[PDB]
Curated annotation (Swiss-Prot), chain B:
Organism lineage: Viruses, Riboviria, Orthornavirae, Pisuviricota, Pisoniviricetes
Protein's recorded name: Spike protein S1
Role this protein plays: Attaches the virion to the cell membrane by interacting with host receptor, initiating the infection. The major receptor is host ACE2. When S2/S2' has been cleaved, binding to the receptor triggers direct fusion at the cell membrane. When S2/S2' has not been cleaved, binding to the receptor results in internalization of the virus by endocytosis using host TFRC and GRM2 and leading to fusion of the virion membrane with the host endosomal membrane. Alternatively, may use NRP1/NRP2 and integrin as entry receptors.
Phenotypic consequence of R12S: In strain: Gamma/P.1
Description of how the protein assembles with itself and partners: Binds to host ACE2. RBD also interacts with the N-linked glycan on 'Asn-90' of ACE2. Cleavage of S generates a polybasic C-terminal sequence on S1 that binds to host Neuropilin-1 (NRP1) and Neuropilin-2 (NRP2) receptors. Interacts with host integrin alpha-5/beta-1 (ITGA5:ITGB1) and with ACE2 in complex with integrin alpha-5/beta-1 (ITGA5:ITGB1). May interact via cytoplasmic c-terminus with M protein. May interact (via N-terminus) with host bilirubin and biliverdin, thereby preventing antibody binding to the SARS-CoV-2 spike NTD via an allosteric mechanism.
Residues of the full protein shown: 166 to 204 of 1273
Length: 49, 26
């Protein structure tokens, strides 16, 4: 499994929050609409098949 | 790494402060 870190930007999560054309996309832990109106220390990604 | 910001006639004065964890250079 690969670990990626994201830092030093403004996190416009609306790009992936407004895809709506993805098979199974679940956001657990935050309200996605208010995610673009809230702030975070780090952004990480983990992917597994 | 956390961040990577890679961007006697002459006299240079520098002031270094790190307060509240914020690092300031003057």
């Amino acid at each position: 499994w690969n670990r990626k870190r994201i830092s030093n930007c403004v996190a416009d999560y609306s790009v992936l929050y407004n895809s709506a054309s993805f098979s199974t996309f679940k956001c657990y832990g935050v309200s996605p609409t208010k995610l673009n109106d809230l702030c975070f220390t780090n952004v990480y990604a983990d992917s597994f098949v | 790494c956390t961040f990577e910001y890679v961007s006697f006639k002459n006299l240079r004065e520098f002031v270094f402060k790190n307060i509240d964890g914020y690092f300031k250079i003057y």
